[PDB]
Amino acid sequence: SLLIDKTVIVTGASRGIGRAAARECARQGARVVIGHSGSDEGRAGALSLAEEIAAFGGTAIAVGADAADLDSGEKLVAAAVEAFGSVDVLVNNAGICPFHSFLDMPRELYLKTVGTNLNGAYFTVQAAARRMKEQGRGGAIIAVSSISALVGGAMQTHYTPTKAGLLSLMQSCAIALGPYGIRCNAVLPGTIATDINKEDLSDLEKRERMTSRVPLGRLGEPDDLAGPIVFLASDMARYVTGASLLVDGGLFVNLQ
Amino acid sequence: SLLIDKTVIVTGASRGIGRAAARECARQGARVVIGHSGSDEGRAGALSLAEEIAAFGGTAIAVGADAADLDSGEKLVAAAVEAFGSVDVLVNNAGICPFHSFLDMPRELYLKTVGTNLNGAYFTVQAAARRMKEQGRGGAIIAVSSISALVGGAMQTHYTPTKAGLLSLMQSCAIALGPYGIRCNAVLPGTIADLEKRERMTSRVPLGRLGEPDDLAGPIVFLASDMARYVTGASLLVDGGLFVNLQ
Amino acid sequence: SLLIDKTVIVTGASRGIGRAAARECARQGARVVIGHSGSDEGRAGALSLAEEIAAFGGTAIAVGADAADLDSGEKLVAAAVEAFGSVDVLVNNAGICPFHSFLDMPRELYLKTVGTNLNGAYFTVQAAARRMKEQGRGGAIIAVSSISALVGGAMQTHYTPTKAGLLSLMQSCAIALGPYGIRCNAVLPGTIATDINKEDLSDLEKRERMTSRVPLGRLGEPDDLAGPIVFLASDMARYVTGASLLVDGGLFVNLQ
Amino acid sequence: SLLIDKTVIVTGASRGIGRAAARECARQGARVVIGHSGSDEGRAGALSLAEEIAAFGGTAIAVGADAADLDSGEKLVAAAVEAFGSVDVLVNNAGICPFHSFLDMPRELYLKTVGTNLNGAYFTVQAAARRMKEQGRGGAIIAVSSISALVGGAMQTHYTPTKAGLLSLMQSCAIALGPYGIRCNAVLPGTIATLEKRERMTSRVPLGRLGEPDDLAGPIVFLASDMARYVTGASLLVDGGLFVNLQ
Numbered sequence A, C: 001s002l003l004i005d006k007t008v009i010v011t012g013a014s015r016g017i018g019r020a021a022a023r024e025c026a027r028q029g030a031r032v033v034i035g036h037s038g039s040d041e042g043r044a045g046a047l048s049l050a051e052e053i054a055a056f057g058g059t060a061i062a063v064g065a066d067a068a069d070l071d072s073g074e075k076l077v078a079a080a081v082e083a084f085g086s087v088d089v090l091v092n093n094a095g096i097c098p099f100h101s102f103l104d105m106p107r108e109l110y111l112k113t114v115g116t117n118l119n120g121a122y123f124t125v126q127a128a129a130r131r132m133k134e135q136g137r138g139g140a141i142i143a144v145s146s147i148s149a150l151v152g153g154a155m156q157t158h159y160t161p162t163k164a165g166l167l168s169l170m171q172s173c174a175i176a177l178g179p180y181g182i183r184c185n186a187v188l189p190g191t192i193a194t195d196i197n198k199e200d201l202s203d204l205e206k207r208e209r210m211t212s213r214v215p216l217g218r219l220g221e222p223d224d225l226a227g228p229i230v231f232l233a234s235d236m237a238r239y240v241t242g243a244s245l246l247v248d249g250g251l252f253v254n255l256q
Numbered sequence B: 001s002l003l004i005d006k007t008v009i010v011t012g013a014s015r016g017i018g019r020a021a022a023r024e025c026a027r028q029g030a031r032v033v034i035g036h037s038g039s040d041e042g043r044a045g046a047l048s049l050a051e052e053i054a055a056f057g058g059t060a061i062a063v064g065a066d067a068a069d070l071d072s073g074e075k076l077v078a079a080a081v082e083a084f085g086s087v088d089v090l091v092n093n094a095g096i097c098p099f100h101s102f103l104d105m106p107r108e109l110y111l112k113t114v115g116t117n118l119n120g121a122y123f124t125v126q127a128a129a130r131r132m133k134e135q136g137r138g139g140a141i142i143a144v145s146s147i148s149a150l151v152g153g154a155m156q157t158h159y160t161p162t163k164a165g166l167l168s169l170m171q172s173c174a175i176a177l178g179p180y181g182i183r184c185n186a187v188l189p190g191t192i193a194d195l196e197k198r199e200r201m202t203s204r205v206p207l208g209r210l211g212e213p214d215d216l217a218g219p220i221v222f223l224a225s226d227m228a229r230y231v232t233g234a235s236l237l238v239d240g241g242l243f244v245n246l247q
Numbered sequence D: 001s002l003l004i005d006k007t008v009i010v011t012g013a014s015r016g017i018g019r020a021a022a023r024e025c026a027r028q029g030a031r032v033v034i035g036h037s038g039s040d041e042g043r044a045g046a047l048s049l050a051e052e053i054a055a056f057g058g059t060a061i062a063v064g065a066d067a068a069d070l071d072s073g074e075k076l077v078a079a080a081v082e083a084f085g086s087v088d089v090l091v092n093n094a095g096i097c098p099f100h101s102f103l104d105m106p107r108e109l110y111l112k113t114v115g116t117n118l119n120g121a122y123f124t125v126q127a128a129a130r131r132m133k134e135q136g137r138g139g140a141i142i143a144v145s146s147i148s149a150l151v152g153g154a155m156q157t158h159y160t161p162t163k164a165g166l167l168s169l170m171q172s173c174a175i176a177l178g179p180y181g182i183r184c185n186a187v188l189p190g191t192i193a194t195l196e197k198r199e200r201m202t203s204r205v206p207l208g209r210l211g212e213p214d215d216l217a218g219p220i221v222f223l224a225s226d227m228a229r230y231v232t233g234a235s236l237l238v239d240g241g242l243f244v245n246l247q
């Protein structure tokens, strides 16, 4: 009952963290806009989650919107107002992570990662915030960043600046949207077992080395992020804006 | 619904932030141990809260336990097991903030500040963690630090190291207690409630209002619940945007 | 002295922080590639600094390289090698901060800021790291970020993520370029009195109010960054990589 | 030379980082006051460094000053002005790190840890800062903290809050001493080596080598010099990239 009758837009919600965060939002009474990339795989996943959300009495719609396309922000807002009447929460989750070495990093891979992880998020946040301010009823914006926003990654010279930039956008947006009662925060997931980690997880030796680094003793699951996202979108966090929240099982603080 | 059949110990729960957290924890279904300094004001406030919690169907006791006395942790843990038979959550909230200039800080005031704010919290955490481990069912530990754990204060040279010290403790203990399923986190409140000075402080909060003690209940109950089962070693600002608002 | 027999590239060295840093490295015995954007004003300033560096026996050349142009980084390294034989230090300083509100941010303004401050830096850092690894004698890279990498600004929703992304790029590049003896760090200046913020300093009430928030009791000057920048590029910082350093007179910690 | 005519006090300056920093300041023209713990070996090391400093033309004195004894701050200051007529820089390096598990952490072990690392540093800083204000010619203060001021350590639950608090102490003192031209900053060294496990620890450092005391003398002399005239309330990691290299 934390988001009853609220409209929640979750970009990249056909798989992994976004999918489980869109489910728990409908379980908290929200009508969810299930944004996806527009591919035929993301359409299969977004419509699969919709079947599951309606299965427990929820209500949700699938919207195709490539994050790299800067028009996608207004496309999601329009389809959310038209189906449910408002936009109350934006969970910005869409992003890529193509691991690659720095010195031979192709230019087009860098811009593709920046355009998708940061550029599209900016104007997706702007279009959602514009609707929130017009309504005058406040709102919440949560950006799924990463632990990599505080530390480095050798194969991620193109990826971590977009996660660190995503965190810094919530800080400056909190000051700008504060006078309109719009809260902007970021969750920093640690090591979550998801579709990006398929090849690395099957190796048992690497997985034990990854698990050994986490004080809680296990890798993360998409459901582990759903709670803190519903929390940051709720009245329980009514005085929380411009903040970050690690969800990593203690990974960041466990210096070897 | 979030804390059914859990035993929560809140130190300094007679006034301010700890009082509002203890009340909310009781609403969530928890058996709460209300801790106070043992003074007349602390004992009176602990009673009044136990009266209100009992009136709406809660379960709570009131235990006096000076945070500076390093024995209080085991005293509150013994009082908790004796009444409810478990210890599952600890909210270390007790603390003082006596403003004072730096170049003339007397040893007495500093040692009382570090002794109340940090030294007592350490062994209060130690006591609660000892019971959680031997129980074998996990548990949560939340320390009420401050936004002053990330920045400084000229009249708080003796105070901000204890806040940042409390944050560091939650980082280390989360390592040493992760295998026993004991999560440790720190909440960082901002400015929680001269009218010309009151609005000048409000001018710097992007949300446009000072905090209230109930603004810390939600964040504390979230960290102590299954909503945060993968959240340990983290800090959470609860300040209305005060930290990011640079000018 | 500290930078003898060393070639330092300093982008955006015609004015402000870059001009002071390039002059100081030359005072420490280095041969400085003075980078500018190519404008007539920039070229005049780069030439003015070179003539000053020659006045006290130093050696420097002026090279135009539009940071918004992603081909400029390879042209900067080539000009340095051709004239001096090596690239040993890179001070990435070129950047802009066009103040603008968030909700009506034009697409051109955001993309111009991100492309200049972050995207151009990435490939200027790549081209310089490529030469340093090739030479086999290590190097140093210093990105001029900002205190805005740790906090926000309501009129800088597009600008602070490029500063936070520069810091994080240095963290990730420290790991990737560590085995080759290349140290990567970032300086976070506070409010330095330059042309990037001159309109706010044109007001006496605004200038004195900003000074009130600095514990050291004065706004920064460009030379206040030259010392810290030369320290990080020298053997003094032998064991310093992936770190940040505030040069703000205490502005960050002074909670209001 | 960057520290000519300046008087520098270095606590814990008989071994490790403090010894390397005290010698490096002497090579920069400073009159060094080599503080030590008063132990048998401590006085030997501090007196051997003063002859080594005098061997290359420097000027240094040795002063026994137990950091846990809060009287030490004014003892070093008075000994510095008696010997050199001034106090211009304070390098607070003295500290202990006794690794110990948390759930059976003795009370007296915690109290010695915090007392030496934080409380004793507090009043050493205060004693030096009052003399710097009395001279009215500015000053600089450097606190040797650690990477553990930002992360956790399961066997260092008593240790990391002391180092996180020393950072928080420089932040707040920066504000309180800014108006007097006193800069306060902290260095955060990584694994400073002062063989099966030594190989694995090196594999986590991007620079590919562990730390040595001299690796910290450059950062310290920089923060103490005019090259950092606008640097106060800052912290500098000197860890060869250990903090940023996750995994």
Ligand SMILES: NC(=O)c1ccc[n+]([C@@H]2O[C@H](COP(=O)([O-])OP(=O)(O)OC[C@H]3O[C@@H](n4cnc5c(N)ncnc54)[C@H](OP(=O)(O)O)[C@@H]3O)[C@@H](O)[C@H]2O)c1
Binding pocket: A011, A012, A013, A014, A015, A016, A017, A018, A019, A035, A036, A037, A038, A039, A041, A042, A043, A045, A065, A066, A067, A068, A069, A093, A094, A095, A096, A097, A116, A144, A145, A146, A147, A188, A189, A190, A191, A192, A193, A194, A195, A196
């Ligand atoms: N998994 C981890 O361990 C981890 C750790 C730290 C941070 N993160 C971040 O958290 C986010 C969620 O990751 P995950 O665990 O769910 O795995 P994931 O496979 O990376 O999911 C990311 C989602 O973004 C969508 N996507 C890719 N390109 C898109 C585009 N143009 N437009 C719209 N959506 C696009 C993806 O497909 P669809 O559009 O079809 O939904 C996907 O649903 C990611 O952005 C990731 O960077 C993940």
Ligand SMILES: NC(=O)c1ccc[n+]([C@@H]2O[C@H](COP(=O)([O-])OP(=O)(O)OC[C@H]3O[C@@H](n4cnc5c(N)ncnc54)[C@H](OP(=O)(O)O)[C@@H]3O)[C@@H](O)[C@H]2O)c1
Binding pocket: B011, B012, B013, B014, B015, B016, B017, B018, B019, B035, B036, B037, B038, B039, B041, B042, B043, B045, B065, B066, B067, B068, B093, B094, B095, B096, B116, B144, B145, B146, B147, B189, B190, B191, B192, B193
């Ligand atoms: N309010 C803010 O703006 C703010 C800002 C930053 C941090 N904080 C944190 O919030 C915590 C409580 O402050 P508050 O806002 O709630 O103000 P408050 O109304 O004065 O609350 C103080 C509480 O801590 C207890 N306390 C103080 N000294 C104690 C001692 N020796 N032994 C046992 N208990 C002691 C008190 O118990 P008794 O009732 O028995 O006296 C009291 O319940 C503190 O730990 C502080 O660090 C608050």
Ligand SMILES: NC(=O)c1ccc[n+]([C@@H]2O[C@H](COP(=O)([O-])OP(=O)(O)OC[C@H]3O[C@@H](n4cnc5c(N)ncnc54)[C@H](OP(=O)(O)O)[C@@H]3O)[C@@H](O)[C@H]2O)c1
Binding pocket: C011, C012, C013, C014, C015, C016, C017, C018, C035, C036, C037, C038, C039, C041, C042, C043, C045, C065, C066, C067, C068, C069, C093, C094, C095, C096, C097, C116, C144, C145, C146, C147, C148, C189, C190, C191, C192, C193, C194, C195, C196, C197
């Ligand atoms: N000043 C401050 O208070 C402050 C605070 C925080 C961070 N910073 C950072 O410090 C850096 C420099 O700031 P500043 O104070 O020196 O401002 P400034 O006085 O305006 O100088 C900016 C320099 O960057 C160059 N520039 C702008 N766009 C360029 C482009 N496409 N290509 C190449 N060069 C370009 C400029 O060269 P031209 O002469 O050719 O235009 C100029 O030399 C910036 O990255 C800024 O973000 C400054």
Ligand SMILES: NC(=O)c1ccc[n+]([C@@H]2O[C@H](COP(=O)([O-])OP(=O)(O)OC[C@H]3O[C@@H](n4cnc5c(N)ncnc54)[C@H](OP(=O)(O)O)[C@@H]3O)[C@@H](O)[C@H]2O)c1
Binding pocket: D011, D012, D013, D014, D015, D016, D017, D018, D035, D036, D037, D038, D039, D041, D042, D043, D045, D065, D066, D067, D068, D093, D094, D095, D096, D097, D116, D144, D145, D146, D147, D188, D189, D190, D191, D192, D193, D194
């Ligand atoms: N070793 C590392 O890798 C590392 C890493 C990060 C941080 N640190 C921190 O940085 C500091 C220096 O590192 P280190 O390895 O070089 O330490 P150390 O030399 O091995 O021993 C501590 C130094 O301070 C002195 N000391 C201990 N207790 C004292 C007391 N009451 N009063 C006065 N002096 C006392 C010691 O003896 P004397 O007084 O006789 O000289 C010694 O010079 C340490 O305090 C440590 O906390 C160390």
